[PDB]
Design a protein around this ligand. Structure first.
Ligand SMILES: [Cl-]
Ligand SMILES: [Cl-]
Ligand SMILES: [Cl-]
Ligand SMILES: [Cl-]
Ligand SMILES: [Cl-]
Ligand SMILES: [Cl-]
Ligand SMILES: [Cl-]
Ligand SMILES: [K+]
Ligand SMILES: [Mg+2]
Ligand SMILES: [Mg+2]
Ligand SMILES: [Mg+2]
Ligand SMILES: [Mg+2]
Ligand SMILES: [Mg+2]
Ligand SMILES: [Mg+2]
Ligand SMILES: [Mg+2]
Ligand SMILES: [Mg+2]
Ligand SMILES: [Mg+2]
Ligand SMILES: [Mg+2]
Ligand SMILES: [Mg+2]
Ligand SMILES: [Mg+2]
Ligand SMILES: [Mg+2]
Ligand SMILES: [Mg+2]
Ligand SMILES: [Mg+2]
Ligand SMILES: [Mg+2]
Ligand SMILES: [Mg+2]
Ligand SMILES: [Mg+2]
Ligand SMILES: [Mg+2]
Ligand SMILES: [Mg+2]
Ligand SMILES: [Mg+2]
Ligand SMILES: [Mg+2]
Ligand SMILES: [Mg+2]
Ligand SMILES: [Mg+2]
Ligand SMILES: [Mg+2]
Ligand code: NA
Ligand code: NA
Ligand code: NA
Ligand code: NA
Ligand code: NA
Ligand code: NA
Ligand code: NA
Ligand code: NA
Ligand code: NA
Ligand code: NA
Ligand code: NA
Ligand code: NA
Ligand code: NA
Ligand code: NA
Ligand code: NA
Ligand code: NA
Ligand code: NA
Ligand code: NA
Ligand code: NA
Ligand code: NA
Ligand code: NA
Lengths: 160, 172, 142, 132, 337
RNA sequence: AAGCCUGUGUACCAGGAGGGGAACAACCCAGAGAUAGGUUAAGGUCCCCAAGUGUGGAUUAAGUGUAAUCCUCUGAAGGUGGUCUCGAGCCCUAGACAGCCGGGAGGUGAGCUUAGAAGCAGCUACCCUCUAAGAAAAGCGUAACAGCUUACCGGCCGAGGU
RNA sequence: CUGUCCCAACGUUGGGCCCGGUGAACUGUACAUUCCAGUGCGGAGUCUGGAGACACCCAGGGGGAAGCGAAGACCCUAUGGA
RNA sequence: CGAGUGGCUUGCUACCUCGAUGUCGGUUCCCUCCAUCCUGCCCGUGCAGAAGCGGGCAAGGGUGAGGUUGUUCGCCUAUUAAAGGAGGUCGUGAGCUGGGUUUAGACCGUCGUGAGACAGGUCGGCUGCUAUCUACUGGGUGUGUAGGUGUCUGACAAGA
RNA sequence: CGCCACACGGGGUAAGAGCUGAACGCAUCUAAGCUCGAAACCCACUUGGAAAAGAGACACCGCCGAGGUCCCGCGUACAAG
């Protein structure tokens, strides 16, 4: 199913699990990556991937983008490189599909998506000055898998 | 901007409209230098290329006009010469100058002679397996040389195996 | 064969549309106009796109027909017709009191209308009407 | 192919039944296709003297029957024109079975052959008893 | 899926209407190469026979062997270039400037023209020479007419008039050449322009067939099988799709067929002679007996017997000329039988 | 999703002229007795077509564009040393950036591993001389050498460069 | 077995075409020489923009007039019928 | 995983027509689109050659004949340079055909107490009209240019 | 169903191959310029075409007579015309 079907925020918030059953599990494997035993403050460089447009990102997209980003960090810094990446959003919004025609149209439950407002941090990675260009590359690959245009922003980091 | 090119003692350069002619002991070359708001003129002993605009596109042509003129200075004095070597593996390639065009026979065993016409007052001299393309107009000479190499072009088969042809050996 | 033109316009190095616009206005005011040196008239832009537009007009047509001129003669004449209500009495009279010529069949040199002249020293992206006709397949009779 | 040296009005079509002028054991042949031929909408693919055609065996020995082989048209009832203007026509329509190299599959040829076929298929000719 | 198929007939010979002139009009002429000379000639179609020839083609396996060839006999008596017309180059193409006429006229030219009684050849000539000095002189052509009276088999005496271009060396030389021919009496023959073995382009108005249907006129199919018995036999399926809501001129329809001008290219001139060598026993059916200047054209020629046909040196030959072919035999066998 | 279905508030069409919008129920101006003069609104002032080929300045080279709104006027993620403008850091006449010329040296072919490995298979170390430079060698190359260049220093050049 | 087909041709008879005589019907809101696009209740000769277009008449095969012919026999609706 | 283009399929909607815009498939005849099957010109190759594979430009021309099936589609055969796809009221019934869907007769299976039914199968089962306008193919008569004969020019138009 | 005839070549381009060449001292097929390069485009060739409203040109004949129509005998033409 194309994202065109779910990317917009044209529907009421639909997250109350006490009134919604049969919700598919999330495909997102992890939210905390790298060295989760270490603190973010232990790093000189902090780069975030910022969403430029308000949208809904299906859990399948979060996984694909997160995967393609962390997979790169692993390939360039090693399975235990000195870095830590975070996917701060969780797919709370439940999605439907009307899969009879328009009669009794209320859709059956098909998935979940995360609502992200423009200007927000979807991903935030923490690394050393050396690995700064590696995290910028992970993010480049990550924004190619989500609907909106993004900004790769260096927050804590002035070895520039 | 403005750039001044002091013409060599050996040379004398005349100019009318958008055309510039450069004459030397080795010949004469006339060229059209036409571009928006770029004035080329002969101020006694120097050629002047100037313009009231300084945008990227204008600067590009100004620098281009300079080298064009400088190349003309060199062409009417020292001249331009391209060196070429005719190489073949199985079939003896016959390269001859006939009229105003260089002809190549028996290329890769071909019955039909490959040929190309020489540009301008360009001279092609052959001494065995060596060729020398020369003249005062770098444009004409450069093309004549290139055309000769392009004349033995092969697309049908693997060039790494079928390397026959005339190639540019020395470039001025 | 003789045309008592009250005004003789020289189109050499002039922007066809700007000339046409003025020639249309004058013809509607009662003036008999003669456009001279049409082959040397000019239109600004990228030659490749300009040519495509005119080639398309040649190709267009059917049984009812779409006769589009190839010679710089007609191109200019047609350009003027588009600035006149040629189907109305007043429009047709004005149009018929206007004639375009290849070169200058008159003794007098034409006058250059204000704001129509193109400076070749300041422009490189433009085309000659004659060049367009040659590309269209016209017989260079000028 | 090489010029026949004669103009031919194809007298056969896809589906025609013709005589197998050899001793291969095949008596009757059914035309299926004509080598190198391309027709036009609704046109029955045509074959005539000198053409190499694909064929199936309709009559003959059990082993030869139903086989799909190649053959060469040796004789045809419809006339053909020779350079001198004269027309030449045969008593029947006949073809000789041939292999990949255009060599007759059989040992002997039955009945006459047209001289024009000889030009194109040498080994077929050098097996002919009569050449008219 | 509805197999593809080329459309019925060519769209390049239209509109398929009755020709305006029964006398053909070449719309193209040969290029200027050799010496100055008239670029065409005319004759009257007589009929057909065959000839045995010696294979001329150097690339033919049959080179030197006997070969039967179809031939159309055309009576080609001498014609008369009665005037020299001059064209001037103008911004609107070529326009006739003036003409230089003669005094010697065929006894029956007045059956078609209002023959000149008073004319100033030199004034016209002067005007042409001044035009040439100015460099405004376009090509040069000769007003020519036939002498049907010389051809007994043709009922007409009224001459056929046509203009033929003169191509040659310099314009000055060919201008002089033109004037010379005209001044004499304009009398010229097939020999003067053509040589047996050369290729010529023959123009002519085809045999008329009046109104004919799409099957004959355009080559469309006849209704097939069961369809052929329903009430429709030689009518096309439809005049077009729903849209466009109009009948396109490209759909094959009924109309005038035949009596059109055609210019058949590359016709080999087998022989140019005089006498009765080519005449058939009993006479050419619907024509008569040939005994005079003739031309044997290879193959067929557009038009019916008696019609005026035009010759012109091939403007786009494929093969090189193989002059004076050896004619070993010309059939005189009756065409009746 | 719909020129979709179904609410709600409001104005309009329906039942609303006239001006504009190419045409066009509901978009803009505008609510209108007749007649007459005048001034504006929306919108527009190169011609078609009433009014500017108006003024100061800048951008665009694609005919982009000359398309408020819209079933109607598309154009996206992604990309761009196309071009214009503005800012920050660093280097530079003690000569920067680039290019061209010259030098790119010895202990020593480091030790180990290995038949061999000598900058460059792998492991480890990565030391000091001459000097204005020159790695226990950044990239090709060899069976291994050779060979070719990067770093590094000098010259030529001369103005911004990154 | 053969023109059903390849692939169509020629011919025969009656029409067709022209002339004398006889002499209807269907159909008709108006206007109407249209074509390409657009627009419009979304399938326009007639609106908009262009293009083309001198008038009348003869023959033709039927592309369009969502052609003529029949208050849809499908479907639904009616507090209809049989 | 993300962004799109098309409007050939299917679905959705119920805007248009129920005082009717004649169905499917086929046929015949015309025009077109390009997302190119062949052909031309090219680039790359895991390009020696030969034979290929993939890609670019490109719509000029070509893309055919048969066996089963009403079939569209599709399966299969032999040929072929290749035997491309799609739009034109799913082009084309005032052109044809009428094999299928879908009238009235009948049989079988299933369902039903039954009349009778079936998004099951099967045999049989009709194709109206003299063209007013417009459109085009061809043929005339007039008028305009403003007496005649003959010969030409070439704005444009068509072609594969 | 038989027979005859139906190019080549130019010009300008696409994709592409290159030349000279700067912005950016180098490099660079491109930004200005240029050499090439498709069955495609233009020309060539065939057909139509003075109603092209800028409604054409030339020569001769003629305006009391040139020419044309009707008529008659016929077809290389044709449904009327
Ligand atoms: Cl047209
Ligand atoms: Cl108007
Ligand atoms: Cl410019
Ligand atoms: Cl076949
Ligand atoms: Cl049929
Ligand atoms: Cl009110
Ligand atoms: Cl434009
Ligand atoms: K209905
Ligand atoms: Mg190969
Ligand atoms: Mg068929
Ligand atoms: Mg019937
Ligand atoms: Mg006979
Ligand atoms: Mg006989
Ligand atoms: Mg109401
Ligand atoms: Mg005004
Ligand atoms: Mg645009
Ligand atoms: Mg908008
Ligand atoms: Mg209109
Ligand atoms: Mg009803
Ligand atoms: Mg019912
Ligand atoms: Mg009841
Ligand atoms: Mg209908
Ligand atoms: Mg394409
Ligand atoms: Mg086409
Ligand atoms: Mg249909
Ligand atoms: Mg179709
Ligand atoms: Mg119909
Ligand atoms: Mg019907
Ligand atoms: Mg009917
Ligand atoms: Mg049926
Ligand atoms: Mg049945
Ligand atoms: Mg049935
Ligand atoms: Mg009038
Ligand atoms: Na339901
Ligand atoms: Na994105
Ligand atoms: Na312009
Ligand atoms: Na046109
Ligand atoms: Na019937
Ligand atoms: Na019948
Ligand atoms: Na219909
Ligand atoms: Na109201
Ligand atoms: Na309006
Ligand atoms: Na535009
Ligand atoms: Na029959
Ligand atoms: Na109709
Ligand atoms: Na109705
Ligand atoms: Na059908
Ligand atoms: Na094509
Ligand atoms: Na089938
Ligand atoms: Na329909
Ligand atoms: Na049908
Ligand atoms: Na019917
Ligand atoms: Na070309
Ligand atoms: Na006229």
């Amino acid at each position: 199913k194309p994202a065109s079907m779910y990317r917009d925020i044209d529907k009421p918030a639909y997250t109350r699990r006490e009134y919604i059953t049969g919700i598919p599990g999330s495909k997102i494997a992890q939210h905390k990556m790298g060295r989760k035993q270490k603190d973010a403050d232990d790093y000189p460089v902090q780069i975030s991937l910022i969403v430029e447009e308000t949208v809904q990102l299906r859990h399948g997209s979060l996984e694909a983008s997160r995967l393609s980003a962390n997979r790169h960090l692993i390939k360039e810094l090693g399975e235990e490189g000195d870095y830590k990446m975070t996917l701060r959003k969780f797919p709370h919004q439940v999605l439907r599909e009307n899969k009879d025609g328009m009669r009794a149209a209320f859709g059956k439950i098909v998935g979940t998506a995360a609502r992200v407002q423009a200007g927000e941090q979807l991903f935030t990675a923490y690394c050393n000055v050396e690995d700064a260009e590696h995290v910028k590359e992970a993010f480049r690959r990550a924004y190619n898998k989500i609907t909106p245009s993004c900004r790769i922003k260096v927050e804590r980091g002035e070895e520039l | 901007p403005r750039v001044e090119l002091e013409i060599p003692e050996d040379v004398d350069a005349e100019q009318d409209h958008l055309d510039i002619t450069v004459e030397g002991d080795n010949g004469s070359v006339t060229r059209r230098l036409w571009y928006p708001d770029i004035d080329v003129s002969v101020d006694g002993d120097t050629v002047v290329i100037e313009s009231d605009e300084d945008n990227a596109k204008t600067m590009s042509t100004i620098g281009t006009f300079q080298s064009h003129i400088e190349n003309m200075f060199h062409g009417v004095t020292e001249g331009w010469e391209y060196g070429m070597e005719v190489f073949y593996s199985h079939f003896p390639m016959q390269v001859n100058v006939e009229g105003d065009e260089v002809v190549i026979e028996n290329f890769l065993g071909e019955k039909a002679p490959r040929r190309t016409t020489i540009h301008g007052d360009t001279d092609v001299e052959i001494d065995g397996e060596e060729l020398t393309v020369s003249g005062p107009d770098i444009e004409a000479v450069g093309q004549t040389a290139a055309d000769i190499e392009q004349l033995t072009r092969i697309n049908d088969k693997d060039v790494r195996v079928f390397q026959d042809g005339v190639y540019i050996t020395r470039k001025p | 064969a003789e045309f008592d033109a009250d005004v003789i316009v020289d189109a050499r190095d002039c922007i066809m549309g700007r000339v046409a616009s003025q020639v249309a206005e004058q013809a509607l005011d009662g003036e008999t106009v003669a456009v001279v040196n049409a082959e040397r008239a000019v239109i600004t832009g990228r030659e490749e796109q300009i040519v495509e537009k005119y080639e398309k007009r040649v190709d267009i047509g059917n049984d009812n027909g779409y006769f589009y001129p190839k010679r710089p003669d007609g191109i200019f004449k047609r350009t003027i017709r588009g600035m006149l209500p040629h189907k109305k009495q007043r429009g047709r009279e004005a149009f018929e009191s206007v004639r375009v010529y290849l070169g200058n069949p008159y003794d007098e040199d034409g006058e250059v209308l204000d704001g129509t002249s193109l400076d070749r020293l300041s422009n490189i992206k433009f085309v000659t009407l004659g060049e367009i006709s040659e590309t269209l397949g016209a017989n260079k009779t000028w | 192919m090489e010029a026949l040296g004669a103009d031919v009005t194809q007298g056969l079509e896809k589906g025609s039944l013709i005589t197998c002028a050899d001793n291969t054991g095949a008596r009757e042949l059914k035309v299926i296709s004509v080598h190198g031929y391309s027709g036009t909408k609704n046109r029955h693919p045509k074959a005539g003297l000198g053409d190499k055609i694909t064929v199936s065996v309709t009559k003959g020995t059990p082993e030869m029957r139903r086989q799909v082989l190649e053959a060469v048209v040796v004789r045809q009832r419809k006339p053909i024109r020779r350079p001198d203007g004269t027309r030449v026509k045969f008593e029947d329509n006949a073809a000789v079975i041939v292999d990949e190299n255009e060599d007759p599959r059989g040992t002997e040829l039955k009945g006459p052959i047209a001289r024009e076929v000889a030009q194109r298929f040498g080994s077929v000719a050098s097996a002919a008893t009569m050449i008219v | 899926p509805q197999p593809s198929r080329p459309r019925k007939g060519s769209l390049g010979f239209g509109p398929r209407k009755r020709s305006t002139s029964e006398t053909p009009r070449f719309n193209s002429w040969p290029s200027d190469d050799g010496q100055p000379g008239v670029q065409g000639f005319a004759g009257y179609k007589a009929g057909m026979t065959h000839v045995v020839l010696v294979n001329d083609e150097p690339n033919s396996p049959r080179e030197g062997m006997e070969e039967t060839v179809p031939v159309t006999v055309i009576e080609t008596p001498p014609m008369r270039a009665v005037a020299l017309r001059a064209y001037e180059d103008t911004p609107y193409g070529q326009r006739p400037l003036t003409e230089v006429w003669t005094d010697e006229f065929h006894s029956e030219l007045d059956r078609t023209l209002d023959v000149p009684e008073d004319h100033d050849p030199d004034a016209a000539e002067e005007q042409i020479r001044d035009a040439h000095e100015a460099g405004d002189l376009g090509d040069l052509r000769l007003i020519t007419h036939t002498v049907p009276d010389a051809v007994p088999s043709v009922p007409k005496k009224k001459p056929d008039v046509m203009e033929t271009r003169v191509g040659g060396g310099s314009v000055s030389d060919r201008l002089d050449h033109a004037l010379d021919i005209v001044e004499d009496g304009g009398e010229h023959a097939m020999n003067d322009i053509f040589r047996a073995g050369e290729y010529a382009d023959v123009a002519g108005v085809t045999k008329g067939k009046g109104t004919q249907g799409p099957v004959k006129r355009w080559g469309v199919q006849k209704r097939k099988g069961k369809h052929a018995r329903q009430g429709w036999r030689r009518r096309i399926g439809n005049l077009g799709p729903w849209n466009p809501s109009r009948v396109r001129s490209t759909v094959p329809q009924q109309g005038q067929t035949g009596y059109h001008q055609r210019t058949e290219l590359n016709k080999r001139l087998i022989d140019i002679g005089e006498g009765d060598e080519p005449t058939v026993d009993g006479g050419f059916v619907n024509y008569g007996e040939v005994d005079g200047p003739y031309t044997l054209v290879k193959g067929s020629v557009p038009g019916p017997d008696k019609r005026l046909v035009r010759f012109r040196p091939a403007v786009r030959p494929n093969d090189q000329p193989r002059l004076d072919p050896e004619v070993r035999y010309v059939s005189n066998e009756s065409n009746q039988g």
